[PDB]
Point group: D2
């Protein structure tokens, strides 16, 4: 249920393959920020979720460097997949920038993205 | 040459990681705490061309807490930066999401912060 | 704008008064968790926000002790009051529990609550 | 043991009074950011904590407006007090700025501050 194309509330595009081993692989294209075109992502998911109708825990990382831009920063999304007719991946995220020590206190943004199958 | 190696956090967890030339992080994680035993697979990304102005190197990785022995139906992501030099450090904040029922989703996610050094 | 009765996505009820000095005062009733009836809250807001279409920054705290229950924990909500389709307060929150030192790594839950004035 | 002056790892100064009803009142002075002099804070704490060595849960808020300056932002610290010879207040915090709706995705910084008595 995880493999495919997903879209968040900003209009970003998350293209992922869930491997049998628990691997997540794919690309991310952000609608916002210091970003253009696609970025590599990798992550992990629970390949044997609870069979009580609980979500499937997962997470992935993008480092914001590709052949076009380098924003010296990385986002991790941590969340859970919920299947069915309105399938969703509900996440919270941490976006850490490379900073000097003096500016480390303001290195990290936090937010929340909800992914669905329709934009 | 800096990130690759064996790291330990303030809890005594062990983070064995290899930084690829392509920006990949690969390795294993063993937690000293929680619903975990032995090693778990990790993967992540890092900035392979960091600034040269004294800024840290941004990185992140994920562990799903399923291995051959146990499954805690949960995943942690660590987001942070590597700080080079004589006492190299990886300073992170993390999000640990559990798979929940819809009605318990409000309490799905723990947050914390881990600092790693190469000292056992 | 801020003064009034708000409801989040869980059906919790946030009754607040925005004072002229930047004070927030009122009560919170959670629909979920180790909580019953109303709890005291206090907080602060920007009493001279920008006039460029930006939101109004604010935050508040509830300690989960009242006359009925004590959950040995406190939540802070940090967010902004916004206009748009309807009046809304968009937050992220941190819920810290009092823990032993050994359990402090799992002391803090994180989430996000959006409030409107619409009674469910 | 909460009432008094506390200092974090940035060199900021947290002056607080813990009232018998669970109130926190005081002033905060940040060593960093868009901040000058002292700001009002208010918050709440667990006035009947467990007696098993567990910390005392608490939180407070600063809106970054005072008579000198206005940074159109607010920080909330959520954490626990731990007493004893090496007393600490261990926190995580959320700093939200007032933004346009288009910029709301980047409204909020997160971090962690440890306060000590010394
Ligand atoms: O702007 C960047 C990179 C792009 C971040 C895009 C973010 S990821 C979380 C959120 N969900 C999305 O779909 N899009 C946004 N980095 C900055 C450099 C300095 N500070 C940080
Ligand atoms: O306990 C678990 C899995 C193990 C987490 C270990 C955590 S990762 C962040 C922190 N840093 C470490 O080095 N260790 C801890 N998951 C639970 C199931 C129910 N809720 C959640
Ligand atoms: O369950 C509690 C107290 C009640 C928390 C209710 C939370 S506040 C954030 C969210 N938004 C709401 O409107 N309701 C929930 N505390 C536990 C002791 C053990 N761990 C934690
Ligand atoms: O710089 C500001 C206000 C000052 C924040 C200081 C922060 S509070 C958390 C941390 N712990 C401290 O003791 N100091 C720092 N606000 C900005 C306007 C734009 N974005 C954000």
């Amino acid at each position: 249920g995880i493999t495919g194309t997903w879209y968040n509330q900003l209009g970003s595009t998350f293209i992922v393959t869930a491997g049998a081993d628990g691997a997540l692989t794919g690309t991310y294209e952000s609608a916002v920020g210091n970003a253009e075109s696609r970025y590599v992502l990798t992550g992990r998911y629970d390949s044997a979720p609870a069979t009580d109708g609980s979500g499937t825990a997962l997470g992935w990382t993008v480092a914001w460097k590709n052949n076009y831009r380098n924003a010296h920063s990385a986002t991790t999304w941590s969340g859970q997949y919920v299947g069915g007719a309105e399938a969703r991946i509900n996440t919270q995220w941490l976006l850490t920038s490379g900073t000097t020590e003096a500016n480390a206190w303001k290195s990290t943004l936090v937010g929340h993205d909800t992914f669905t199958k329709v934009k």
